[PDB]
Amino acid sequence: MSKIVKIIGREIIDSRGNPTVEAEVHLEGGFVGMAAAPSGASTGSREALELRDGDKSRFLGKGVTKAVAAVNGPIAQALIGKDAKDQAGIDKIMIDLDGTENKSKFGANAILAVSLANAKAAAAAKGMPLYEHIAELNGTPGKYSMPVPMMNIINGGEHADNNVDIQEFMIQPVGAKTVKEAIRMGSEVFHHLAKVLKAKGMNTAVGDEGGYAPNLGSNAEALAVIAEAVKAAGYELGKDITLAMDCAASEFYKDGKYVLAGEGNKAFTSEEFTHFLEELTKQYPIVSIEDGLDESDWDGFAYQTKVLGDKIQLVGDDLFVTNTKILKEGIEKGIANSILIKFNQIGSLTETLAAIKMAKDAGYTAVISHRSGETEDATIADLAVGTAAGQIKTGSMSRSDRVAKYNQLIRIEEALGEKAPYNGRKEIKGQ
Amino acid sequence: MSKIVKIIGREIIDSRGNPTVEAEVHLEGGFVGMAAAPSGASTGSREALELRDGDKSRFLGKGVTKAVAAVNGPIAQALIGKDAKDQAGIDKIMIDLDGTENKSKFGANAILAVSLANAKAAAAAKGMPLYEHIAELNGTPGKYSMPVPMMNIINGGEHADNNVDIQEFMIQPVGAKTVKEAIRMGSEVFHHLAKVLKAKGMNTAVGDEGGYAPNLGSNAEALAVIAEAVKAAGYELGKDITLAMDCAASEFYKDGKYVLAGEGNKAFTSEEFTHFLEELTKQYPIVSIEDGLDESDWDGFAYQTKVLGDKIQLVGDDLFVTNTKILKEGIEKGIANSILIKFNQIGSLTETLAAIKMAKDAGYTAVISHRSGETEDATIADLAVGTAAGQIKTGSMSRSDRVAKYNQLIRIEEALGEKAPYNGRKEIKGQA
Amino acid sequence: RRYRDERYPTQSPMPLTVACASPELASGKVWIRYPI
Ligand SMILES: [Mg+2]
Ligand SMILES: [Mg+2]
Ligand code: NA
Ligand code: NA
C-alpha cells in the first residue's frame, strides 16, 4: 500500500574517516527514510561481506562506490513499486537478487542500508516511530523496554593503539530506574575515570568507541581504575554498577593458544583462559563476558559455558555473527547463553529480527550492538526498544557516534514513559 | 500553516559526555524542526552566557535543566501562535523576554536551540531545505557555495591532555574541485598521519575534535608531521593543501606574556609571539591563523595585522565572539581580517546572520565553526552553504560529532551541483 | 531584493507526533520530495 518510488545511495564518511553506504527510500505520498551501514574492525570471519572498492587512489582502497552503485542500480530497480510495509518481502527481493550466501555481489553494506531506510520510510507512512513499527513487524505490538546499556569506557584491542589486548571494558548502570538516569550515571563515572587516569599520568585521549585508551601494566588493571572511578563518582560497585567485557579473543588467538601481547605474550590454553576469566569475575562484579574465546573454539566455548554460564552472561559475537543458522547450532550444543546483535553481520532487518527471536525462544539474551565504525545514525536505539531486547551496547559516553544513540534513547523514553520499563539487573542472563 | 503550536526542550548529551539543550519546534501544519546547542571549552570571556545548573549531584554540576525549563515554559509560551517564517521576529521575542545583554536569564543555549529548531521548522513549512531558507532569510536567495574546510587533525590546548599548547593544527584542501573531493583528500591525509605518528611511536588516540593528541617535542613539530603526511598521501603542500592554526592564545596568556607550557614555559611578549608566528608562515604554507593573541590584546592584534595581515588570514574567534558590536570596533580599528562564526557565542540565528553580513561588507571573511563540544546536529553545514560564507571549521575526519557535518555537506553538494561552487583557495583572505 | 513565488505546503505529508519518530526528517538530514 506504501509504494517505493525512488531509492538513492551515496558514499558518506563513518566515525573513523572511512567511506560507508547511506541509503534513502522514498515512497509515494512523500514518506522518506534514511539509514547508513556501520563498519566493524574486529570482523568475524563469517560476517556477511562488507563490499569495498580496493582502489588505492581513493580512501586508501576503502571506497564503497561499488556498493553504492548496487543501491542506485539493481537494488533500486528491483524495489520500485513494492510495498515498503512488507519488510520481509523487501529484504527477500534484495537477498535473492544478490543470490550469494554472504551477500558478496551487492555487499551487505548496500543491502542493510536499504533494509533499514525502507523500514524507516514504512514507519513514516504509518505515522509512527520506527520502534513502534519494528514492534509491529516483530508480531509483538506495543511491547517495549528501555535497554540496560553496557558502556565501553576503556578501549583496547583493535580499537586503540595502546597495549591493552582486551577490546572493551564496560560499566552497566543496573541500579538506575530509567535509561535517562543510567546515561547520567555513565557520564559521571566516565568523567571521574578521566580524573583517576590523569592522577596516574595515564592518557585520556579516546579510542574508536569513545573510551580512554591508556597503556596499562596489565589487562586487569582496567578493571581496577574503573572500580576507582565508580567509587569516586559515589556509586556502589556490584549494586549500582556491574561490569562487562568484550575480549574479542579471536583477535589474539595464535597457533591454538590465546596470547596477551600487551603482557609480554603471556600464553593460555583455552582451559587456562577460561579460568583466568573466572578469577576476574571473583575479584570484580563482572556479570557479562563477550567472545571470551576464538570464534572457531567451540570445544572451548562448551567448557566455558559449563564453568561460567550459570553465573555469567556469555555473549557470542564473532561466535554467532547475528546468523540464525550458526546460533541454532550453538543453542543445540550448549554454547554461550547470549548473542550480540549486529545487523551488518547478516545484512537485513528481517534476518536480524529472526536472530533476536531465536535467542529469546531459547532463553538466550539478545544485546543490540553498534560497530566500532559508526555514523550519526541511531537505528539500534529504535531496534532495542521495539524488540524489548533489554540490553544495548553502543559505546562510551563520548563521541556522538556513540552518544547519538543515547540521545535517541532519552527521546524515546520521554515519549513512551511507563510503556517502556527499564528492568535493570534482571535483563542480564544469570541475574 | 506555519504558526508554532508546540516547543519541547530536553536535556541530551554532547560529544564530551556533558548535557546540552535540544529543542523541537512544531508548527500547525505538522512541520517539525529539531536542533541542539553546542558547547565550547576555550570559551571567550565575552561569549553569551551558557546557563548550567551547578547541582553537584547531577553531571558534576553541568546539568542544563534550568535552560530546558526556560525553553518549555516562558520561551515556548511567548512563541505559541507566532509565525515561524519570521525568524527575526521569533528571535526578538526571545531576546527581549530574556531582557539581558548576555542572555543570562534563560541562557544562550536555550534561546539558540529554539532559534535553530524554529528555522528548520519554517524551512519545512516552506517545502525547502534549511540552506535554501537561510539564503532567503539572508536576502540572497539562490546564492550558494560549498565551503572550503579547515580540518583539525592534531589537537592540543584545552582539547587534549598532551603537551601541545596550540589548540588546533589544520589542513585545507584548496586544490579540490568539489567539497566531496576535499573530504576524501582530508580523510586520506588524516589516515596517512596516523602511519607517520605510529612510526615515531606517538599517540594516535584522538582529542575532543577528532585529531590525534600526541606529545610533541615542540609546537612546531605538529606542522612537520602534518607536512610529512601530506607528502605520503601524494599531495603537494602549498598547492593541493595549505595549513591553518587556531592558537587559542588566550589560554596561555599569563601575566602579560604568552607562555608555551609544553616547551618549558617559553615566554613571549605580544610582539615576540607575532614574529614567532611570522617565521612559521615562512617555513610552512600557513595561510590562516586564528586567535594568535589574547582576546584583550587589541594593541597586539593591531601590530599582528600590520605584520601578517597582507599575506595571512587573521581570524578573530574569542576576539569578536560572533558579536556585531565587537566586530564593528575591530573593523574600525583595523584589527584582523576574518571572523570565526559560532552561533552559540551570540545565541540566535538572526544575530549570527548579522555578524556574517557585517564581515562580508567590510571585506573580512567569515568562517562558520563548530564548538569543541558538539552533537550529531549538522546545522552549520546548512548555514555555511546558505550564506555562501566560503569557509567552514568543523573538525578532523574522525568522530561523528565532526563527520556528521561533512556528510551533510556531501548531501547538500549532491543536491545543488553547480549551483554551489567550491571556490577553493581564493575563499581565504589574502589568497587569489 | 528577495523573490516571492507560488509557494508552500499546506499540511506536511509526513507529520511526526514527536521528533524521535524520524530524527533524520526533524534534524533536516533528509527531505520530502515535492511535488506530491
Ligand atoms: Mg565484539
Ligand atoms: Mg577558536
Ligand atoms: Na590495543
Ligand atoms: Na594540551
Q: How far apart are CA A218 and CA A200, in angstroms?
A: 15
Choose among A289, A141, A155: nearest CA to A216.
A155
Same domain, A280 and A407: yes
Show residues of chain A in contact with B188, CB under 8 Å.
59-60
Which ligand lies nearest the alpha carbon of A157? 3
Same domain, A135 and A271: yes
Q: What is the 3-state secondary structure (H, E, C) of A101-154?
A: CCCCCCCHHHHHHHHHHHHHHHHHHCCCCHHHHHHHHCCCCCCCCCCEEEEEEE
Contact between residue B260 and residue B219 where contact means Cβ atoms under 8 Å apart? yes
Q: What is the DSSP string of A207-273?
A: -TTSSB----SSTTHHHHHHHHHHHHTT--BTTTBEEEEE--GGGGEETTEEEEGGGTSEEE-HHHH
Which ligand lies nearest the alpha carbon of A222? 3
Same domain, B84 and B176: no
Same domain, A254 and A229: yes
Q: How far apart are CA A23 and CA A120, in angstroms?
A: 11
Q: 3-state DSSP call for residue A34?
A: strand
Domain that holds residue B180: 128-432
Q: How far apart are CA B336 and CA B305, in angstroms?
A: 5
- What distances in angstroms separate CA B77 from CA A79, B94, B113, one per listed residue? 46, 10, 15
Nearest Cβ partner of C28 from B141, B142, B382? B382
Q: Give residue B81's region: left, alpha or beta (phi > 0; psi -120 to 50).
A: left
Strands of B151-155's sheet in order across: B148-149, B390-393, B365-369, B338-341, B313-316, B286-290, B242-246, B168-172, B151-155
Residues B192/B195/B199/B202 CA torsion (nearest 10 deg): 100
The residue with cell 588493571 is A221
Choose among A61, A187, A121, A149: nearest CA to A349.
A121
Same domain, A306 and A168: yes
B382 touches chain C (CB under 8 A): yes
- What distances in angstroms separate CA B319 from CA B274, B316, B330, B336, B358, one per listed residue? 16, 5, 9, 9, 15
Choose among A225, A227, A255, A173: nearest CA to A423.
A173
Q: How far apart are CA B130 and CA B57, in angstroms?
A: 39
Choose among A224, A119, A130: nearest CA to A169.
A224
Same domain, B412 and B285: yes
Q: Determine whether A342 is an active site residue.
A: yes
Measure the CA angle with vertex C4, ends C15 and B144; round to 5°: 80
Q: Which residues contact B251 (CB under 8 A, 6 or more apart)?
A: B42, B157, B158, B165, B167
- Chain C nearest-CA residue for A131: C21
C-alpha cell at B66: 534550568
Which strand (E) or helix (H) includes residue B211?
none
Show residues of chain A in contact with B203, CB under 8 Å.
161, 203, 205
C-alpha cell at A295: 570464534
Q: Which residues contact A38 (CB under 8 A, 6 or more apart)?
A: A14, A20, A342, A344, A370, A371, A373, A374, A375, A377
Same domain, A414 and A273: yes
Same domain, A406 and A260: yes
The residue with cell 553547480 is B418
The residue with cell 572451548 is A300
Pair type for strands A257-260 and A253-254? antiparallel
Look at residues B98, B127, B156 and tell me which one is the last residue of a structural domain: B127
Same domain, A10 and A121: yes
Eight-class DSSP state of B320: T
Residues A362/A367/A369/A372 CA torsion (nearest 10 deg): -100
Q: Would you mind telling me the total number of residues written for chain A in this entry?
A: 431
Q: Would you mind telling me the total number of residues written for chain B in this entry?
A: 432
Can you list the alpha helix ranges (DSSP code H) found in B126-165? 130-137
C-alpha cell at B34: 529539531
Q: Which residues contact B422 (CB under 8 A, 6 or more apart)?
A: B145, B146, B148, B176, B177, B178, B179, B182, B413
Q: Is the peptide bond before A147 cis (omega within 30 degrees of 0)?
A: no
Q: Which residues contact A57 (CB under 8 A, 6 or more apart)?
A: none
Q: Is B257 exposed, middle or buried (0-12, 13-18, 19+ CB in 10 A)?
A: middle
Nearest Cβ partner of B34 from C10, C15, C27? C27
Cα torsion A270, A272, A274, A276: sign: negative
Q: How far apart are CA B403 and CA B412, in angstroms?
A: 14
Q: Give residue B329's region: left, alpha or beta (phi > 0; psi -120 to 50).
A: alpha
Q: How far apart are CA A251 and CA A292, in angstroms?
A: 11
A30 touches chain C (CB under 8 A): yes
Q: How far apart are CA B208 and CA B214, in angstroms?
A: 13
C-alpha cell at B58: 547531577
Look at residues B66, B95, B127 and tell me which one is the last residue of a structural domain: B127
Contact between residue B228 and residue B171 where contact means Cβ atoms under 8 Å apart? no
Torsions phi, psi for B94 (to 5 deg):
-70, -45
Q: 3-state DSSP call for residue B396?
A: coil
Contact between residue B36 and residue B401 where contact means Cβ atoms under 8 Å apart? no
Contact between residue A183 and residue A414 where contact means Cβ atoms under 8 Å apart? no
Query: Which residues on adjacent β-strands are paired with residue A260?
Result: A266
Q: Determine whether A120 is an active site residue.
A: no
Same domain, B289 and B355: yes
Q: How far apart are CA A67 and CA B367, in angstroms?
A: 35
Same domain, A365 and A259: yes
Pair type for strands B168-172 and A286-290? unpaired
Residues A110/A111/A117/A120 CA torsion (nearest 10 deg): -160
Looking up residue A47, the CATH number of its domain turns out to be 3.30.390.10
The residue with cell 526542550 is B9
A120 touches chain C (CB under 8 A): yes
The annotated binding site of A is made up of 41-42, 159, 167-168, 209, 246, 290, 317, 342, 371-372, 393
Q: Which technique?
A: X-ray
Looking up residue B239, the CATH number of its domain turns out to be 3.20.20.120
Q: Considering its fold, how many domains does chain B have in total?
A: 2
Q: Which residues contact B254 (CB under 8 A, 6 or more apart)?
A: none
Q: How far apart are CA A412 and CA A128, in angstroms?
A: 12
Find chains touching chain A: ≥3 CB pairs under 8 Å: B, C
C-alpha cell at A388: 524489548
C-alpha cell at A115: 533494509
CB contact (8 A) between residue C15 and residue A128: no
Measure the CA angle with vertex B113, ends B107 and B117; round to 5°: 155
Cα torsion A135, A140, A141, A144: sign: negative
Look at residues B127, B153, B178 and tell me which one is the last residue of a structural domain: B127
Same domain, B120 and B169: no
* Secondary structure percentages of chain B, helix, strand, coil, to 5: 40, 20, 40
Whole-number CA gyration radius for chain B: 21
Amino acid at A277: L
Question: Beta-strand (E) ranges in A336-412?
Answer: 338-341, 365-369, 390-393
Amino acid at B16: R
Choose among A344, A281, A320, A340: nearest CA to A116.
A344
Q: What is the DSSP string of A272-290?
A: HHHHHHHHHHHHS-EEEEE
Q: How far apart are CA B173 and CA B150, in angstroms?
A: 8
Amino acid at A408: Q
